[PDB]
Amino acid sequence: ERRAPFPDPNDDPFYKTPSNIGTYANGQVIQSRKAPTDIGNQNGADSFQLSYRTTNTQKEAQANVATVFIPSKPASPPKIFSYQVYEDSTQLNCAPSYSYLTGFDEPNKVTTVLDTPIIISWALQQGYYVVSSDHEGPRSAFIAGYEEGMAILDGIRAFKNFKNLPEDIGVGFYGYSGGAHATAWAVSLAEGYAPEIKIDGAAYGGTPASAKDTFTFLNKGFFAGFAVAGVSGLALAHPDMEAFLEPRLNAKGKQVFEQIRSRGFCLPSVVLHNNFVDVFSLVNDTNLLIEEPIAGILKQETLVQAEASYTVPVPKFPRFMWHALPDEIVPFQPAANYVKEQCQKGANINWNVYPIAEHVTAEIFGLVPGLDFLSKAFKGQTPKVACGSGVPAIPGINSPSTQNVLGSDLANQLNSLKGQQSAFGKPFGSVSPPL
């Protein structure tokens, strides 16, 4: 029954990059302001907006905004929770920060309204400082991982200088669909860009490791419009790719793209549009991708080391990744292949694969677990798992009890075998592996 508390981001100057941006240090806040949030209200938690220097893909000084929350009573020691919204849109109004603002009118508000309140409540009901950040930035480039990763790390650095937090503060990433993508890239970059950010863990699911693989799955699909949003975001991130594209737009394609960059064309829009359309149709040249610079930009826009024209980095810290096996929107496979690649390079990836789930459904399944996990990681207690797997069936911890299964006697007999010499010369164990 109330309306937007703020000027639209294009109009608001806060969002505009300053002429002093080059002078401003990375992860340094140019300015800030209080900021009214439905979520921030539900949790009594002061919400703010931080206009902070960052870096774009071309390694250029640009400003950017994040939305931070401060729980009424912080955990000791202090912990930082980072949530990446699946904005999946190429326009500024679609920014998560605008979405966090109150009232029906904001376009991307729906993405914040569903799962996000539940999550950032919990993250605050546990005394973690929250940050969410406009991961596409002024460019508003969807699926542009390098740009998304730098901004999120800069936002945590900004969050830290704004609340004078401890550089050792342990941070906790979260994401799904496009937020997983933005996450997945922020960790991959985190070591190179922001080493001073301790990370107790990070959960994320429904993640597209490769933009090119995702686009191919999306193209000629109901979700093809997301691929058009993808192409447009990548083009905003890579301006030599824009130079390529602009001329090749047939009269249709010129309007497809100025529509998907138009005001109010956010996630809800982007889902209903360009359904079943071949992206290739809008471009004059059918191959499009093979011609440079998109092919080799796509070579850098992937975390799958098979395609990558660079050496994909490998997050060691304990991670938690899920994916609907039949993920009708984000290809399950390149996800698996990142995880596997990353497991032979030695990562701590509790991988959960839902066999009977959609993109939409699986967001909810591994929500509880991903947060349960995210709790433990902060306590330094991430259940120790074979990489690429989950916890295996441990009676009483995650499978039936030794007594419910065998009965009391047989379970007592099994509980005796402890310490006794196996048929192989070694002690037998306990039925519960080590915790």
Site for ligand NAG in 254-293 (CB under 6 A): 284-285
Binding residue (CB under 8 A) for a copy of itself from 18, 103, 117, 239: 117
Using DSSP's 3-state secondary structure scheme, residue 330 falls into coil
- Catalytic residue among 47, 140, 177, 210, which? 177
Sequence-ordered list of residues with C-beta below 8 angstroms from that of 286, at least 6 positions apart, any chain: 280
Count, residues near ligand NAG per rule CB under 6 A: 4
Q: What are the percentages of helix, strand and coil residues in the chain, rounded to 5?
A: 40, 20, 45
Tell me, yes or no, if 359 is annotated catalytic.
yes
Length of the chain: 435
Rounded (10°) CA dihedral 35, 99, 201, 386: 170
DSSP code, position 93: T
DSSP code, position 107: T
Q: Residue 251, interface with a copy of itself (CB under 8 A)? A: no
Residue 322, token pair as written in the block = 């899920």
Q: Residue 424, interface with a copy of itself (CB under 8 A)? A: yes
Q: Residue 346, interface with a copy of itself (CB under 8 A)? A: no
Specify the residue, 51 or 183, whose C-beta has the smaller distance to a copy of itself.
183
Show contacts with a copy of itself in window 183-222 (CB under 8 A).
none
Q: Residue 405, interface with a copy of itself (CB under 8 A)? A: yes
- Any bridge partners for residue 293, and if so which? none
Sequence-ordered list of residues with C-beta below 8 angstroms from that of 135, at least 6 positions apart, any chain: 84, 85, 87, 96, 148, 151, 152, 179, 182, 186
Q: Residue 242, interface with ligand NAG (CB under 6 A)? A: no
Count, residues near a copy of itself per rule CB under 8 A: 78
Specify the residue, 313 or 390, whose C-beta has the smaller distance to a copy of itself.
390
Tell me, yes or no, if 327 is annotated catalytic.
yes
Q: State in Å, rounded, how far the first CA of the chain is from the last one.
A: 51
- Catalytic residue among 181, 238, 323, 359, which? 359
Show contacts with a copy of itself in window 347-366 (CB under 8 A).
351-366
Q: Residue 58, interface with ligand NAG (CB under 6 A)? A: no
Binding residue (CB under 6 A) for ligand NAG from 163, 248, 299, 376: 248
Specify the residue, 162 or 244, whose C-beta has the smaller distance to ligand NAG.
244
- Any bridge partners for residue 68, and if so which? 48, 131
Q: Which residue is nearest to ligand NAG (CB)?
A: 284
DSSP code, position 80: E
CB of 30 to a copy of itself, least distance (A): 31
335-361 core/surface letters (b: 16 or more CB in 10 A; e: else): bbbbbbbbbeeebbbbbbbbeebebee
Tell me, yes or no, if 105 is annotated catalytic.
no
Q: Residue 25, interface with a copy of itself (CB under 8 A)? A: no
Show contacts with a copy of itself in window 271-330 (CB under 8 A).
271-272, 322, 325, 329
Q: Residue 407, interface with a copy of itself (CB under 8 A)? A: yes
Residue 171: which of 195, 198, 150 has the closest Cα? 198
Q: Residue 372, interface with ligand NAG (CB under 6 A)? A: no
Beta strands in 96-141 (DSSP E): 129-133
Partner from a copy of itself, ligand NAG, none contacting 361, C-beta within 5 to 8 A by type: a copy of itself
Looking at 212-220, 227-235, 289-297, 398-406, which segment touches a copy of itself (CB under 8 A)? 398-406
Looking at 61-69, 141-149, 298-306, 384-392, which segment touches a copy of itself (CB under 8 A)? 384-392
Please answer whether residues 135 and 81 qualify as being in contact, where contact means their C-beta atoms are separated by less than 8 angstroms.
Answer: no
CB of 53 to a copy of itself, least distance (A): 30
Q: How far is CA 106 from the centre of its chain?
A: 22
The rounded distance, in Å, linking the Cα atoms of 260 and 256 is 6
Residues of this chain that interact with ligand NAG (CB under 6 A) are 247-248, 284-285
Residues with a catalytic annotation lie at: 177, 327, 359
